[PDB]
């Protein structure tokens, strides 16, 4: 109400950034050509990932007919997902 | 020279280092605003970890570039 919305777009902005730094390492992700830390990392910022995608179901099961909220949430955790099996194949491959 | 260090949590420190600043000093230097300990933090820029060894004309850091503060619990 009053500044539920900000600690709300403050989680959002937290999701896109992990969806963001993520992604930006599994494109510079080469099978030999990488490090130990650098992958490694990267299946942490994984971890860390399907949480907070799990977050995002947790506020969705806390909303009635409510509009954006749910849209956004939504949205997000689809990025979320998206980036999950993403990071799945790449990693496998 | 100024660069960024954005974390996930949102915080969006601002610093002062030389285009070929050691990550040993850098760390330090992050530690000398947000008091983290440099052995529980990770810095990623281009999708790649910064080892210490290395300095950031060895990873090409433009002035005002933007690097990821990440922790190692």
Known sequence: ?93 | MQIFVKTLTGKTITLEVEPSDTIENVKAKIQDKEGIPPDQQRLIFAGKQLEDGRTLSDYNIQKESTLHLVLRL
């Open chain 1, 1 to 93: 109400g009053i500044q539920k919305v900000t600690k709300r777009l403050h989680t959002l902005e937290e999701v896109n950034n992990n969806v963001r730094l993520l992604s930006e390492m599994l494109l510079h992700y080469s099978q030999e050509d990488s490090s130990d830390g650098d992958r490694e990392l990267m299946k942490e910022l994984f971890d860390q990932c399907e949480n907070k995608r799990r977050t995002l179901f947790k506020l969705a099961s806390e909303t009635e007919d409510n509009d954006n909220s749910l849209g956004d949430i939504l949205q997000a955790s689809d990025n979320l997902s998206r980036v999950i099996n993403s990071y799945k194949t790449i990693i496998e491959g």
